[PDB]
Coordinates of C-alpha atoms and ligand atoms in Angstrom, one line a residue:
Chain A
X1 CA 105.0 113.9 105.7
X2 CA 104.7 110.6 103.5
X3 CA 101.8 110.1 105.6
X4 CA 99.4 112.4 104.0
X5 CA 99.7 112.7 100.3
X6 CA 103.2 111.0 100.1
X7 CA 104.6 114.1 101.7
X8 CA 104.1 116.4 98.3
X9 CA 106.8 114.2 96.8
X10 CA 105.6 113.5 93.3
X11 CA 107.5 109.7 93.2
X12 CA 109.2 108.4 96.8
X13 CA 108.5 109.6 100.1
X14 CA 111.1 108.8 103.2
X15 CA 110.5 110.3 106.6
X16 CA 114.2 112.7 108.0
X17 CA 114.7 113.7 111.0
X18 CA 112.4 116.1 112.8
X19 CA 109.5 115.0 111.1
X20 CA 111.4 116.1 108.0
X21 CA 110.5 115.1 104.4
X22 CA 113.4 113.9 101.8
X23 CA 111.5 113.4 98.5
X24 CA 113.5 110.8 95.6
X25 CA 113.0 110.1 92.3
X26 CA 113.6 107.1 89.7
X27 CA 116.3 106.4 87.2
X28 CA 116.3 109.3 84.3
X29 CA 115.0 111.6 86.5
X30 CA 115.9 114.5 89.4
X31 CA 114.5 116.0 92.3
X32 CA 112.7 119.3 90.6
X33 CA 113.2 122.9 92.4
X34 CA 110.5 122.7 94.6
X35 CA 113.1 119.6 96.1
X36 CA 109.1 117.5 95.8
X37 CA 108.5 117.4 91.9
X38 CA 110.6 115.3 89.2
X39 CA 112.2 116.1 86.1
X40 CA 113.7 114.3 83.0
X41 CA 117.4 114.0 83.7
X42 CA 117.7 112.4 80.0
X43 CA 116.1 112.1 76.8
X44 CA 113.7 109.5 77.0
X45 CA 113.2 108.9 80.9
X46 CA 111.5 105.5 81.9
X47 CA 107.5 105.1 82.2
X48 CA 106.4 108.4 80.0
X49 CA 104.6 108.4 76.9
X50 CA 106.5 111.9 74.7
X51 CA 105.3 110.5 71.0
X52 CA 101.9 112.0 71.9
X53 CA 100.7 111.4 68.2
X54 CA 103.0 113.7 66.2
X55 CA 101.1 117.0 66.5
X56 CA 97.4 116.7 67.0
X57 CA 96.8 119.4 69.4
X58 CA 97.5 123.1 71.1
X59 CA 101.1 121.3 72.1
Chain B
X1 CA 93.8 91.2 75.6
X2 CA 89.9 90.5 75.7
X3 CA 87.2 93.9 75.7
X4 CA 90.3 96.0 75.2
X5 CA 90.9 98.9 72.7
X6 CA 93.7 99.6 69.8
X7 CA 96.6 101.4 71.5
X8 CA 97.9 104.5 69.9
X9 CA 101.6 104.2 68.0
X10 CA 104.0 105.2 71.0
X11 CA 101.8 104.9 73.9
X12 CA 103.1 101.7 75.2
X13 CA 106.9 102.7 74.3
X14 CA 107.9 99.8 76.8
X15 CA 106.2 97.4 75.3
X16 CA 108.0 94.3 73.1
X17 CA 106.6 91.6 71.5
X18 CA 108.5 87.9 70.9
X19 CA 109.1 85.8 68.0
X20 CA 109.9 82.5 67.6
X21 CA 109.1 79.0 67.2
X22 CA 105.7 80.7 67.1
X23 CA 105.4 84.6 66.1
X24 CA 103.9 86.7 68.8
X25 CA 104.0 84.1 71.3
X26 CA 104.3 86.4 74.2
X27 CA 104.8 90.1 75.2
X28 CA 107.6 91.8 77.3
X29 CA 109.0 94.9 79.0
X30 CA 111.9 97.0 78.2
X31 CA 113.7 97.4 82.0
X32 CA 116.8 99.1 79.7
X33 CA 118.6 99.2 76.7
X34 CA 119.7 95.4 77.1
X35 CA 117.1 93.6 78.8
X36 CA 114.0 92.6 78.8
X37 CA 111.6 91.6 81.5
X38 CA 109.0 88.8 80.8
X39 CA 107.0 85.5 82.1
X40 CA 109.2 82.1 82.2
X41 CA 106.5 79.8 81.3
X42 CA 107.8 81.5 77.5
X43 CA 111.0 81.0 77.5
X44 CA 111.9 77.4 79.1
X45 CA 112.8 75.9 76.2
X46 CA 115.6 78.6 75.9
X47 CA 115.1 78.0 71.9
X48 CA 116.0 81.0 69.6
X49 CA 113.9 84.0 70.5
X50 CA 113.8 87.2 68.8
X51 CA 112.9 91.2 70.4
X52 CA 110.8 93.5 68.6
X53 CA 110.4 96.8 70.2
X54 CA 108.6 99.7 69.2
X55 CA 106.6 97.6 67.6
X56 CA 102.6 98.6 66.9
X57 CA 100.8 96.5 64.1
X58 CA 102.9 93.1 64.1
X59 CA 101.6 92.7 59.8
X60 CA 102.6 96.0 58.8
X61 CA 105.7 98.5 58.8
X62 CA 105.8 101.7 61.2
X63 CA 109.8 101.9 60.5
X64 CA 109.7 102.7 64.8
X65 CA 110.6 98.6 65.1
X66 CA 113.3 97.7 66.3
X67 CA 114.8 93.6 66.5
X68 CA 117.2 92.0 68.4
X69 CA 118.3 88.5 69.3
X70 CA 118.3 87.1 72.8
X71 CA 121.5 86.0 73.6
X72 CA 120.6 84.8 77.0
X73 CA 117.6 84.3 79.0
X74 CA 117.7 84.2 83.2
X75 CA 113.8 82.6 84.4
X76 CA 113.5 83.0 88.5
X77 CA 115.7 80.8 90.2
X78 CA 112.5 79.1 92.1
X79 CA 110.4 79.1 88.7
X80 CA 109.0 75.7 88.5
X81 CA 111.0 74.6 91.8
X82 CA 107.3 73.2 92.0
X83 CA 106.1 71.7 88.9
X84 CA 102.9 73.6 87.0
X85 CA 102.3 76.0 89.7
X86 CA 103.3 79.1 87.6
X87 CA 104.9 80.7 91.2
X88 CA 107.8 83.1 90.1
X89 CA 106.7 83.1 86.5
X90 CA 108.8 86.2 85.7
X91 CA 112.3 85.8 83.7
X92 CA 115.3 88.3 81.9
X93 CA 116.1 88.6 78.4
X94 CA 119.5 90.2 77.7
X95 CA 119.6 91.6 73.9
X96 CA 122.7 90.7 71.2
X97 CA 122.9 95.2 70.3
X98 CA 121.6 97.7 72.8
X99 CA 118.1 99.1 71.5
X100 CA 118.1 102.5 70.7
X101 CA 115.9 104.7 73.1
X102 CA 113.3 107.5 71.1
X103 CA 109.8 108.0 71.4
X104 CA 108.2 104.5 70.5
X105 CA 111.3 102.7 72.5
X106 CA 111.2 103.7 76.2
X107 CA 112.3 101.5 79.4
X108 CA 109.4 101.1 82.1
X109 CA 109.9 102.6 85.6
X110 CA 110.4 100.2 88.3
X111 CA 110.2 101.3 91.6
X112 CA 111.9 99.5 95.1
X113 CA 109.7 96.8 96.6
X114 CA 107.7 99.1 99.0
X115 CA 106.8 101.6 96.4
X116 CA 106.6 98.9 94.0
X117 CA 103.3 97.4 96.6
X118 CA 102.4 100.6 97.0
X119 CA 101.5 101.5 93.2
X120 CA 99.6 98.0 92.8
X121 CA 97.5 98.9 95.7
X122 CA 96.6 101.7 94.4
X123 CA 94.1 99.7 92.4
X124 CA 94.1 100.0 89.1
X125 CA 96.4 99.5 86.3
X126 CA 96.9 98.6 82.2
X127 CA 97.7 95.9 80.8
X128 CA 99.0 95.4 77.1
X129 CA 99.4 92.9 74.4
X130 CA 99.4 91.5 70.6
X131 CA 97.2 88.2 72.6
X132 CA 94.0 86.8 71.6
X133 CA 90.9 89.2 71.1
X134 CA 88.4 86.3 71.4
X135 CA 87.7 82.9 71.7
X136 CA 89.8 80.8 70.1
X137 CA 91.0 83.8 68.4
X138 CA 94.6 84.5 66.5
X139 CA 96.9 87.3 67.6
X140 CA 95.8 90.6 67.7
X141 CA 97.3 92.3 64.8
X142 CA 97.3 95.7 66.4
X143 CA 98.5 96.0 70.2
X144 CA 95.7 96.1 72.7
X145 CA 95.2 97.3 75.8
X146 CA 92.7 97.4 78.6
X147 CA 92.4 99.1 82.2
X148 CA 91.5 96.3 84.9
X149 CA 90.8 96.6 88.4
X150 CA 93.2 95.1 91.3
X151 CA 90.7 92.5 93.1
X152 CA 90.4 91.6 96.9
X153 CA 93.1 88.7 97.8
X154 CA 89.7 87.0 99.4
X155 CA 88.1 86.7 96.4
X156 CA 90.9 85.8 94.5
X157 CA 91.0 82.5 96.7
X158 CA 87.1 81.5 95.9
X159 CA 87.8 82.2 92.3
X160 CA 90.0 79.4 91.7
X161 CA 90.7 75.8 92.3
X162 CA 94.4 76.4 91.7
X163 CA 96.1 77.9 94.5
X164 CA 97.3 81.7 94.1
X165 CA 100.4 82.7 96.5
X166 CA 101.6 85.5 97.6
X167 CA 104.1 86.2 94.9
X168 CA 101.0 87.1 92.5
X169 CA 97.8 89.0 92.3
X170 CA 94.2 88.9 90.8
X171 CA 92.7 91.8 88.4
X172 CA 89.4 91.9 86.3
X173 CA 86.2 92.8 86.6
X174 CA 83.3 91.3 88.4
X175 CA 81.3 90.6 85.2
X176 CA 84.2 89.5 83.2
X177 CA 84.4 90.3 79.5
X178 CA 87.7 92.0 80.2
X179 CA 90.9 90.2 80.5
X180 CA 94.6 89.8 79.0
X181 CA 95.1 86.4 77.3
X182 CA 96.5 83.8 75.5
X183 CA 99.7 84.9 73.7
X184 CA 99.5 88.3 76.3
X185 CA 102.1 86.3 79.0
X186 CA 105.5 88.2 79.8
X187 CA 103.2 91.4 79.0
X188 CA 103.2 94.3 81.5
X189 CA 100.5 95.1 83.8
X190 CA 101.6 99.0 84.3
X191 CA 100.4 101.5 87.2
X192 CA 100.5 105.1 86.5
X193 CA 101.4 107.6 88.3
X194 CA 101.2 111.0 87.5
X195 CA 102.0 110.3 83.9
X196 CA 104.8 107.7 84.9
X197 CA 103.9 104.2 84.5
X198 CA 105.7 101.6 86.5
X199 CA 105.4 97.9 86.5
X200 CA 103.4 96.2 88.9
X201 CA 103.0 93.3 87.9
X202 CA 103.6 90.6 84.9
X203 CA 101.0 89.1 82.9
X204 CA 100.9 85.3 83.6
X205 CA 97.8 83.0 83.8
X206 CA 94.0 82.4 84.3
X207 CA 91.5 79.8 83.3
X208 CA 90.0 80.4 80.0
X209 CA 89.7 84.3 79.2
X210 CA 87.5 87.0 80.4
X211 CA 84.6 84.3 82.3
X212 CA 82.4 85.8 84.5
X213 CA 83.4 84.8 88.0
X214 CA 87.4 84.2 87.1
X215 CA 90.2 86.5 87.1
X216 CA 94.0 87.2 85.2
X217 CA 96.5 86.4 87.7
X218 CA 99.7 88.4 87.2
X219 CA 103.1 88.1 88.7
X220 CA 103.6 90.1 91.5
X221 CA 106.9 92.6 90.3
X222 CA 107.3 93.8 94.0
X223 CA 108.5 90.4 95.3
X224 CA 111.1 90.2 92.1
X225 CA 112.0 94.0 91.9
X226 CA 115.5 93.1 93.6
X227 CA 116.5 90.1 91.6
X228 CA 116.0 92.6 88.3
X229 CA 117.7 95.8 89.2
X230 CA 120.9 93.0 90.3
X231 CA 120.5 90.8 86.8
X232 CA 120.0 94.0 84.5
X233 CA 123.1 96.8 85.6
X234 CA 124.4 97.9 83.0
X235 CA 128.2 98.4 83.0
Ligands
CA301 CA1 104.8 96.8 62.5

């Protein structure tokens, strides 16, 4: 619950009532399914790298 | 940026470079489409300045850059409030025509103050730049970059003469041989999480480069994460 491992939130952590946890994300992005992972919102979401050299790999 | 490595096209897409009265003079963060986060001991002068994102090798052409003017320039209200002290060296650059986001042109995160603290402490972070390679060395025609180590605030003190304050923090290595430099200033020392980088902190000052026994002191972007979410809304 923050406490341990940020609370399984993959950005910000906040503690709710009853020892609740309310996960939040950054700008460009939204609370995944799970309500503890983030997703793009947009195209090209602050602080993540998508060039990734072309094609190089399995991809 | 001294015992660093070449960066690959795109994987700084955050990173800008400034020209001027000088080409690559100093180094910078995209916060959005229409500004630009840097040091102020670049900019005082508030002479003609000019944005190149998406930028890579600063003697060739990728076709990813992207230039625009600076048609105003905000340093820290307190920034030399106290002569030489480089406190609050961090300042705004707000761009003539909105930058175009893709794949080599992408904002940095930046996270409230608590979070912010909370990604620096976590220890270790990159740091970018087109700055000097070696001693007495010109730009670095390809951007660098190089992982360094958060250091002790203990440490930091006994390093240095010159007196380090709270709004900034120490990084290197014990050994040395590993610093940003000259010409790096305004650059972005980025933490990353899970994939997401955010900015904790901004290149600023040191003595010399990469000596054994001395460290890069950067900004602290925690204390200033407030003043730039207010300066840079878009609207
Ligand atoms: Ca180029």
């Amino acid at each position: 619950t923050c406490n341990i491992k940020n609370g399984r939130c993959e950005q910000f952590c906040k503690n709710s009532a009853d020892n609740k946890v309310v996960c939040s994300c950054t700008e460009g992005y939204r609370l995944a399914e799970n309500q503890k992972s983030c997703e793009p919102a947009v195209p090209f979401p602050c602080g993540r790298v998508s060039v990734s050299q072309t094609s190089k790999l399995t991809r | 940026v001294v015992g660093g490595e070449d960066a690959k096209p795109g994987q700084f897409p955050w990173q800008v470079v400034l020209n001027g009265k000088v080409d690559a003079f100093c180094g910078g963060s995209i916060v959005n489409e229409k500004w630009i986060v840097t040091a102020a001991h670049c900019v005082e002068t508030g002479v003609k300045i000019t944005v190149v994102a998406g930028e890579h090798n600063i003697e060739e052409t990728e076709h990813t850059e992207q230039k625009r003017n600076v048609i105003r320039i905000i340093p820290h209200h307190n920034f030399n409030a106290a002569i030489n002290t480089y406190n609050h060296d961090i300042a705004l650059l707000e761009l003539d025509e909105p930058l175009v986001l893709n794949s080599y042109v992408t904002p940095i995160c930046i996270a409230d103050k608590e979070y912010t603290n909370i990604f620096l402490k976590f220890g270790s972070g990159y740091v970018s730049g087109w700055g000097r390679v070696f001693h007495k060395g010109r730009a670095a025609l390809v951007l660098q970059y190089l992982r360094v180590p958060l250091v002790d605030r203990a440490t930091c003190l006994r390093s240095t003469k010159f007196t380090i304050t709270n709004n900034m923090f120490c990084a290197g290595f014990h050994e040395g041989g590993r610093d940003s430099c000259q010409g790096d200033s305004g650059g972005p020392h980025v933490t990353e999480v899970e994939g997401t980088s955010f900015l904790t902190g901004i290149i600023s000052w040191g003595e010399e480069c990469a000596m054994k026994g001395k460290y890069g002191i950067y900004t602290k972007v925690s204390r200033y994460v407030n003043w730039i979410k207010e300066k840079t809304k878009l609207t």
